[PDB]
Design a protein around this ligand. Structure first.
Ligand code: NAG
Ligand code: CA
Ligand code: MG
Length: 374
């Protein structure tokens, strides 16, 4: 085994230590001075991970979905797609860039290697049964779909990207900058755009959505502005939706019909409750008598932060995730929120992110994949 990382210790370049039961290799000869907290999970300038001493598109029945940073951030730089651990079932490349008007582009972070190597890495991951999809979102995640011309640019440019790189499909993580509100033209145009894109690609087209819960389950309690604004998008694309994994973080608690009070952020109940609403369906505070029709369990997963650096609120332990999963799948280990019937085909778990999980020593992916794996 590798020696545990410890403050007061002098390290040389190439030294391998154990931290959070994972390995890190020293990038710089240095001492971890006491009180500085220069630990491997917090210090990518000092440590790099590694070293030693229906019918929908077919993908993992119980899947671990994660986002792969096509950029550098406090988690560290991007890393080659080939090195994404086997615990991940769907690798979501984050992100594509808005190019306007309607146009989308993609440019690889050079730290991931050459475009040619990246394309080979995609094939190699697919050869192992993984899906590799392109996410719309992030810093340039403001898509304009206000007229038919922009829709066509959207469809054509994304078709070019997918066919060139061999992505299995797309992920929608774009709602915060794209003005997705009730009554906005983008709501109708996005559904039309995705349908047209898939028609060009074929039935292998993978489609996922990662909206924040006010845009979805929020509709139960309020319908206007962003609240409930994603529901007709889901409804319009339900035949094409591979999986929706709502982000149950950064937006406080969740009001469901399964408890007299809101379900607490970071609780298994909230994860179970949010998932129940998507599967059973729920009334919409329409003003009319509108309702959201439930999805198949295989179309539903829940999204959580991979760790403390991944979000501002809504953090969960691996144990909490495991509890929510077994509750949903086998009606066992439930809290105060219980499914009406078991969902043996519940799709699973999404996390931001693969990179943060890697930086933190696979503390999310390892136990959660094990839970999904039974
Ligand atoms: C007993 C043993 O082989 N332990 C190794 C460990 O030293 C290494 O850091 C880790 C990362 O690959 O893989 C383990 O299997
Ligand atoms: Ca989102
Ligand atoms: Mg944080």
């Amino acid at each position: 085994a590798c020696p545990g990382w410890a403050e007061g210790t002098a390290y040389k370049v190439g030294d391998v230590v154990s931290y959070n039961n994972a390995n890190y290799t020293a990038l710089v000869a240095h001492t971890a001075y006491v009180g500085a907290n220069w630990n491997p999970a917090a210090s990518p300038t000092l440590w790099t991970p590694g070293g030693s001493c229906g019918n929908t598109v077919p993908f993992a029945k119980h899947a671990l979905v994660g986002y792969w940073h096509n950029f550098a951030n406090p988690s560290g730089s991007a890393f080659p797609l080939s090195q994404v651990s086997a615990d991940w079932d769907v690798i979501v490349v984050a992100f594509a860039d808005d190019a306007g008007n309607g146009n989308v582009s993609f440019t690889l972070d050079p730290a991931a290697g050459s475009a040619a190597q990246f394309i080979q890495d995609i094939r190699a991951q697919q050869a192992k049964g993984k899906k590799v999809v392109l996410s719309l979102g992030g810093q340039n995640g403001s898509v304009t779909l206000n007229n038919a011309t922009q829709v066509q640019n959207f469809v054509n440019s994304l078709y070019g990207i997918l066919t060139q790189y061999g992505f299995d499909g797309i992920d929608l993580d774009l709602e915060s900058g794209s003005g997705i509100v009730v009554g906005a033209p983008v709501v109708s145009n996005l559904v039309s755009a995705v349908k047209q894109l898939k028609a060009k690609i074929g039935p292998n087209f993978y489609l996922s959505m990662a909206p924040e819960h006010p845009y979805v389950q929020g509709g139960f309690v309020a319908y206007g502005g962003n609240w409930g604004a994603y529901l007709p998008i889901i409804d319009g694309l339900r035949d094409d939706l591979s999986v929706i994994h709502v982000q149950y973080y950064n937006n406080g608690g969740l009001y469901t019909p399964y408890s007299t009070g809101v379900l607490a952020e970071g609780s298994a109940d909230m994860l179970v409750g949010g998932s129940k609403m998507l599967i059973e369906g729920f009334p919409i505070a329409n003003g009319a008598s509108g309702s959201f029709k439930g999805l198949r369990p295989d179309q539903v997963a829940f999204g959580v932060p991979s760790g403390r650096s991944s979000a501002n609120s809504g953090f969960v332990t691996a144990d909490t995730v495991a509890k929510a999963l077994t509750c949903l799948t086998t009606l066992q280990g439930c809290g105060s929120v219980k499914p009406a019937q078991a969902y043996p085909a519940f799709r699973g778990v999404m996390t931001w992110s693969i990179n943060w999980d890697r930086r933190d020593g696979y503390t999310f992916s390892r136990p959660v994949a094990a839970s999904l794996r039974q």
